């Protein structure tokens, strides 16, 4: 009839993963009564303009050969460094490869992605170059942008030796800095559910064509193996790549965060469902689900055009992972950034495991199978009204917890004992104008 | 603690889409806080016995050639027109292609469907003929029945330029008429959840068989490519085609509607779940999931029979669409109808969009992110006791809303303020006998 | 505001299927308002050490030929009968093939399973032999263990003629006996959710290699059909076969049941979710989802290694069924059993159907569409704290129902009228030590 | 009703509600002798049936009666041809329903 | 606003809220004649607008008035060049916002 | 089109007939002098003309709509609605008694 302490702690870490108060770590409030190990991964990366030595090419040049460093086309990228740039991070729900960084010479019209599968995508300290025309880059081309993945190795090691898993919470912080007189820029951030699924695209086999005109060999096997089959199953994400542009996100989502670049960002990525069931580790090739080109049987056609129906283009990422379902996909855009910037990324991912016997996790188990429905209902109610992001320095929210959670816990059904906790009003997060008010109208000091 | 006005309006349009009071249009009560555009499509079609000029054939005759009109086999169909006929409409949850009409010379034993993929299925003003033996019809055969799809083009155009969608409500009205002294007939209607899914049937590749008996060419590539792979993914509907016959539906479902033909029908198709999450547009080839023929590994067998396990026959419809999940499939049967009938179909589909930037929908957005749990709980409670269909002239239900919704909104949990609203009793919808009573025992005037 | 009688009866049969009081049969408390037929299958099997006449071999020997009896290698299995043995039952959620029995000469390190698809798996009265090295057994090999499936034929016949189904409850009882002075042994039991899914593994096609060196035939079709496609869809179960060993289950699950062998066991397998929606019959080849061997694109690689990513080994079972989703998988281990034992298995499966018209079920329909949310919430709350198994003779629990259900029904939300029912404490099920206490601290008489 | 044979199909659809009632059987005896032989096809859900007719008649059997008087019972007139039909308590019926 | 043509795109985005109001139209007439022609680009979300200006003016039309007095209305002085701007109720405005 | 566009639109079975009291669209009804003129129905334009960047040579042929002359002259009552009905699916041997009342 009242929220427990464990449920409240879980709610606090789920809504504010990077909060200074969230020192202890607690599991999902369903009391699964299973030996579980809750792991907390905190990582920091100082990303800046990459040097030439950590910059590989994805074209057919590095096809069978391992990664090829740029053959001193780095002059063009220095030319980029002359002017202002744009920096995007895409936080897909992938467990490892927490975020994908991308550097552009100037703001793109849309989040384009290469059709051909890239060669050797690079973990963060290295990058991989893509051409201006949306194609893989070989040496002697026109560089279009740089891309890299931020990889957590310990997450891989632990997901290896685990019977099941579920991601408890994840937050990303973006402490931004630049030399004085070069702080100009804007930061935009937005979350949105991009629910992927295990799908297989429709492909075609190759018909065999043999002409036996041997004197006694005249079989003439001309059979058509050119039928339609299914490619290997891949986890496809329906991220609206054509609408990941900054203005699109701003006008489409009203919880979208906007500020000057120096404020950084802080995205506590949130769920999109009520329940968080355990899942077995299941790494799969990730792909981004593009737009279809052949309508096919969307219009009156014959059987000959039955097969080539509405087949969407699939962009292979050449990256394999098991994703956390039902979590939002986040994305920011640091547009108009000085080239000699410095971004301190700080990611905190806390997630639960069912340890495998004899594995490492078996020595760090925790038996606190607490049950709580009030906390889950409150999480459902808040998910739909919490801001998408915050300034990087914004933590330890006074309204959070003793005020917001208490004021909202009275609403669920009539599971309420305290008559009234506190009236709740619509906040106004005008970070650009310094006219920000919290959920109870109390003005916030933008300095803190 | 009380249902809002927006939640009540949504409930009203969800339960009574064709209601005269439902003039305003409102979105789903979850307050998604996303720019949304709610579109209302109202369409009217005067379907009657088709003339010869709008009647194409689906056999191999129209395989590569476009649609072939019937080569004056129309004499047999006139022979149909001599006697009474039967008319079925199948309202699958497909977004476009709202319903599928079908004309039979006499009542079929079951909803048979052709095994071979038909050639050029026809939008409504045209029809396509199928043979009596359940096969595609070429000219010079025995016509078995006529089939057509009712297509909404604006729905296609809007679903093209939309990031996400969800179907808010859908209703179909069947105003029936016939010349005086020819009103004889019966109408049956029934809804039932036929939850389709993206599945791929198991098919076989073609083994290559080459006999190199050339003097120096003697490789003899005899490798068996005859392995088992997956066909292209299709959205399959498990509609019990063998049990879509009228009597089957009547005896199986107790909410099934029955009346004399002149009364028409009015089906407000209902959901089958609590939540209605947004989905990205995803047109796929629709198929109807038949019955399996080879048991395969359902019995002790070897590996040679491991592959050909329980593979069900799949009936390709040669029609592509993205379906609204979790909504019921409706079906009626106008049996014993005079051949020179006239049915005015009136479909109203209201559904929500997340507009794509620059698209048309972006100019017609609506920001009313209202939240309501009472309305959703009431919808869950009602879905399970609302009649499947109504007489065509039955609208503006007095019991609906101020009485039924109020009387039921007290039940959910104990989220109740008013002590008692009104006792609720089991209605008796005896439309044939003119002894109909509503949810509170008040007799209804069958005239209105 | 209070649990109904039908909801309470459903809860009782769901928690205690083999309870003597559960004579009447009741459906799921959601009031689906559909004609339903609830079927109860009670089966008894006296399993013992099989004789030579009912013992077939799974190797390539019985590949095209039907089952081959053992060619008097039965001497080795008699040698097994000299010493103590181990007996496992695996209760997967398969509707038919309720359990899978397995006999070992001595306790295995893990639940190994053959990589090659076995030949003709045997229904219970017959068994099938597997080699010691984890391979299929042909005559003249070293027998490793025996395996069989317990098959319910009536379930097959009824699932054939049914539009939809859902499994209401299932219980398995293990009355154990042995000659006097041979009762030594231990019994372990455990349930755990192993949520399977329809998956297709990634396989490769065979590239065609033709060398036309005919004088005029020099086409030289060398095209590579060796691409990557998807195998047929199979229902894969992620059962942690490497951790189905007894000690693993004991230390991993704290609700795991342990006792001396003579006590038998009684597993009321439980759900893992709140809702139990109807599903259409959908038999599929079952498979057990092993462990992957090729990391593939889990590490930086090229496109040539993109395809062969993290592909897990799949163990085909050569058995087809449609499984009940969201139910736990149970497993016991009778370790250190005398060879001349005798186990009376008693399985009770009660499950709901939507009858097909004209089918047999249509004559045994039941219209009691009762609705109850309190019962479902109570079931959710109990699922997480009920013991996994019981001694075979333990039924008719006093704490169950009038005490446990009443004491717990006050917790859900504040849907509570009676102020306090009874305090609830943590039970201690120390069946080995005869110090067992129920949910209210009342000591239980191990004799009853 | 059936008594299922073991192993037969009926054995999976059994029902244990062995309720006993003599009042219902006596009422059935009393009604059998005064119920109309047939009805118009559309005539169902009789208002007089059950809460009225069965209650009004259940007081008669012997003196197995608790409620003093339920409702007076009169002879109905089923003149379906003439549209002058009256039920067991004189209430005119709408031939449409 | 549009009156959609049948079958056209607008037909899928219609809105039925035929609200009637004469007070709003009269207030619009009264304000049109005294509202400033333009504003600084950053000037939005006027505090005086709506709850204050519209309320204070809605009492004037005829005597269609329930609230006795809302707020006295004075002539504003929009001296944007000199940073001496005052709104319709004399409250100085911060030129920064 | 009329049914879905107008919510005050009347629909019924044919036997019910109809009764349209055509209404004004304005507040005032000032007197006007008789002024018969050729009536025409204003169709849809075909030549965009200066709706797009063009020269003077295409300045003249701007957005000129097709006009359908009715070859009928009258003076119309301004500000009154235009009514329209449709008796669809009528038996050929029907009989419609029109009764018009105009007071002016």
From TrEMBL, chains A, B, C:
<protein>
    <recommendedName>
        <fullName>Capsid protein alpha</fullName>
    </recommendedName>
</protein>
<dbReference type="GO" id="GO:0044423">
    <property type="term" value="C:virion component"/>
</dbReference>
<dbReference type="InterPro" id="IPR029053">
    <property type="entry name" value="Viral_coat"/>
</dbReference>
<keyword id="KW-0946">Virion</keyword>
<comment type="similarity">
    <text>Belongs to the peptidase A6 family.</text>
</comment>
From TrEMBL, chain F:
<protein>
    <recommendedName>
        <fullName>Capsid protein alpha</fullName>
    </recommendedName>
</protein>
<comment type="similarity">
    <text>Belongs to the peptidase A6 family.</text>
</comment>
């Amino acid at each position: 009839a009242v929220v427990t302490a464990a449920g409240l702690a879980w709610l606090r870490q789920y809504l504010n993963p990077m909060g200074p108060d969230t020192t202890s770590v607690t599991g999902y409030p369903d009391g699964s009564a299973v030996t579980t190990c809750i792991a907390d991964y905190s990582n920091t990366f100082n990303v800046s303009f990459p040097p030439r030595e950590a910059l590989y090419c994805t074209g057919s040049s590095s096809s069978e050969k391992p990664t090829l460093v740029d053959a001193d086309n780095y002059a063009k990228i220095d030319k980029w460094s002359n002017y202002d740039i744009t920096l995007c991070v895409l936080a897909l729900p992938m467990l490892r490869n927490v975020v994908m960084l991308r550097l552009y010479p100037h703001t793109p019209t849309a989040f384009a992605l290469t059709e051909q599968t890239p060669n050797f995508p690079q973990r963060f300290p290295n990058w991989s170059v893509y051409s201006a025309d949306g194609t893989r880059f070989n040496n002697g081309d026109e560089p279009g942008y740089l891309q890299s993945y931020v990889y957590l190795p310990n997450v891989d090691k632990h997901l290896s030796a685990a019977r099941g898993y579920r991601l408890l919470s994840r937050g990303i912080t973006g402490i931004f800095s630049a030399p004085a007189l070069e702080t100009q820029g804007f930061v935009t951030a937005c979350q949105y559910l991009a629910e992927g699924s295990i799908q297989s695209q429709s492909i075609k086999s190759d018909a065999v064509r043999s002409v036996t005109v041997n004197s006694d060999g005249t079989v003439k096997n001309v059979e058509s193996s050119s039928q339609t089959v299914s490619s290997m199953p891949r986890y496809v994400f329906p991220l609206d790549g054509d609408n990941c542009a900054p203005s699109s996100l701003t006008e489409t989502y009203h919880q979208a965060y906007q500020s000057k670049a120096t404020d950084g960002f802080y995205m506590p990525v949130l769920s999109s469902s009520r329940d968080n069931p355990f899942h077995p580790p299941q790494p799969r090739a990730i792909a981004v689900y593009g737009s279809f080109l052949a309508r096919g049987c969307l219009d009156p056609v014959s059987e000959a055009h039955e097969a080539d129906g509405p087949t969407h283009d699939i962009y292979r990422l050449n990256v394999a992972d098991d994703v956390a379902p039902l979590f939002n996909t986040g994305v920011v855009w640091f547009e108009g950034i000085s080239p000699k910037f410095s971004l301190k990324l700080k990611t905190r991912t806390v997630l639960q495991y069912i340890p495998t016997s004899g594995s490492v996790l078996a020595n760090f188990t925790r038996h606190e199978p607490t049950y709580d429905q009030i906390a889950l209902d409150a999480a459902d109610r808040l998910r739909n009204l919490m801001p998408h992001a915050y300034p990087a320095a914004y933590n330890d929210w006074g309204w959070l917890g003793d005020l917001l959670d208490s004021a909202i816990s009275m609403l669920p059904g009539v599971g309420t004992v305290y008559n009234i906790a506190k009236p709740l009003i619509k906040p106004a997060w005008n970070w650009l104008g310094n006219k920000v008010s919290d959920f109870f109208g109390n003005p916030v000091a933008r300095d803190g």
